[PDB]
Amino acid sequence: EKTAVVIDLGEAFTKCGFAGETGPRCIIPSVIKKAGMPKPIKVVQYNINTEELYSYLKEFIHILYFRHLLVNPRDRRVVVIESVLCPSHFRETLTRVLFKYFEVPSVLLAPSHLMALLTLGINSAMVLDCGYRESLVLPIYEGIPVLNCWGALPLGGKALHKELETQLLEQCTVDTGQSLPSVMGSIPEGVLEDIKVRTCFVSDLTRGLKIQAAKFNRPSPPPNVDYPLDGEKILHVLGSIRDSVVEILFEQDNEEKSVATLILDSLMQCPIDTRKQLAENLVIIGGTSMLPGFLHRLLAEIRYLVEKPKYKKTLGTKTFRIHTPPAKANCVAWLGGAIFGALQDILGSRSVSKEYYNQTGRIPDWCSL
């Protein structure tokens, strides 16, 4: 009858396509290309002028639906996959742009973790979404997301970018156009993403502990490979640096916090009957989880933290299984929204319509009244 639209906005990338198709049609990055502009500006931003955001969202949606969808969304429904705890200011702006400017029939602002759970096809699961800005945890038990049990450290893609920028600046080795360290003050983000995808090798638990021991009073430094760059300035990036950048994601000491500890804190907050099913079904999604050799380092670190005396008195013996999804780790949240929209013309009714928005005021966020 009518295949609905699926959107999954974010600061780094944006998964978008049709509901029903196994995986999206395209994934253009969040930034936009403007005429007479030095650098490309990011679309998804927080704490900034309302009318400017509205114009930025219109500009991104306009370049999206022609290239991605090849259709007017005026014919059929939309599924805007907002991550839970995405600012209400930003949701209101999205609601305005979809109804006032474009005039869609319906919209939906559903959470990312519940839809990622619909892909697995199980009702209870602990979920971790390691995106660009934050690494958010949220356990779901029998459909309902357990909200007060949660956690989100500023330790996703953006933290890894900042650490790469710091460590490369400290130890730099650029070719002539050899020596000459710290010539350029900063480096672009698109290049630094390509370095993370290709170079950064994720270490094991025993290797990670050896690196942590070396930092505070050297084993397994290799391997190292150079990275090519434009304008005839190749830089000889090292092997110990990229491993040290990955290590800060799992660094416990002096914060009592990490990607692994965040699941245990979420499990601690959850009730006793819910506890065991969440431990059995531990789902990992998001952008940072696509890194090579990540799921072992997490599961081994999780287990090491359970062996510690502080978590034995509550958790103890637990079968931590990581049931992986059908689609890739970044594109699990989108696939869930595509499942939610395509199949059920019935569950399209619960979402907010154009008729309801004009008279009322806004889509209902999880708040009072």
Residues that bind another protein (CB under 8 A): 46-47, 84-85, 87-90, 110-111, 114-115, 117-118, 123, 134, 140-150, 152-154, 216-217, 253-257, 270-276, 314-318, 340, 347, 350, 364-369
Minimum distance from CB of 123 to another protein (Å)? 8
What does the block give as tokens for 164?
A: 């790469």
HSE, CB side, 13 Å, CA atoms: give it for residue 214.
Answer: 14
In sequence order, what are the beta bridge partners of 5?
Answer: 18, 78
Minimum distance from CB of 355 to another protein (Å)? 20
DSSP labels, 248-315: GGG--TTTT--HHHHHHHHHHHS-HHHHHHHHH-EEEEESGGGSTT-HHHHHHHHHHHHHSHHHHTTT
CB 11 within 8 Å of CB 133: yes
148 or 186: whose CB is closer to another protein? 148
47 or 179: whose CB is closer to another protein? 47
198 or 312: whose CB is closer to another protein? 312
Minimum distance from CB of 115 to another protein (Å)? 7
Q: What is the distance between the alpha carbons of residues 193 and 195, in angstroms, rounded to a whole number? A: 5
What does the block give as tokens for 159?
A: 């933290």
8 or 237: whose CB is closer to another protein? 8
Q: How many helices (H) and strands (E) does the chain have?
A: 13, 11
33 or 313: whose CB is closer to another protein? 313
Minimum distance from CB of 255 to another protein (Å)? 6
173 or 212: whose CB is closer to another protein? 212
Minimum distance from CB of 190 to another protein (Å)? 25
113 or 297: whose CB is closer to another protein? 113
Minimum distance from CB of 223 to another protein (Å)? 28
What does the block give as tokens for 39?
A: 């650098």
Q: What is the distance between the alpha carbons of residues 64 and 8, in angstroms, rounded to a whole number? A: 12
Q: What is the distance between the alpha carbons of residues 21 and 157, in angstroms, rounded to a whole number? A: 28
In sequence order, what are the beta bridge partners of 140?
Answer: 125, 145
Minimum distance from CB of 111 to another protein (Å)? 6
E strands, 27-155, are: 31-32, 41-42, 78-81, 109-110, 125-130, 135-141, 144-145, 151-153
E strands, 82-237, are: 109-110, 125-130, 135-141, 144-145, 151-153
Minimum distance from CB of 204 to another protein (Å)? 22
Which secondary-structure segment (H or E) carries 78?
strand 78-81
293 or 364: whose CB is closer to another protein? 364
